[PDB]
Protein: ubiquitin B
Organism: Homo sapiens
Amino acid sequence: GSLVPRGSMQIFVKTLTGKTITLEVEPSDTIENVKAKIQDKEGIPPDQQRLIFAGKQLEDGRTLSEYNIQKESTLHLVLRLRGYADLREDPDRQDHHPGSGAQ
């Protein structure tokens, strides 16, 4: 199916190699949507990919806006296990879409 055009802001995330990677996630989207973009950056599974906020890990159910994660929020990715036993390849990627809704 297609994707509906909704709000989307840019955030700052830090890696284990002291490298900051730029990511984009909707204000209503959840952590599940965030890692989705990370797959293109490093390409790691959810069991190994975990988001941290204010020292507290993040999980699904809630949205970025609920985690006080703004366009200037600092995210951290911590890995516990190892995977890299999968692949990822599909068109219609790397495309910027418009926004909508109120705040």
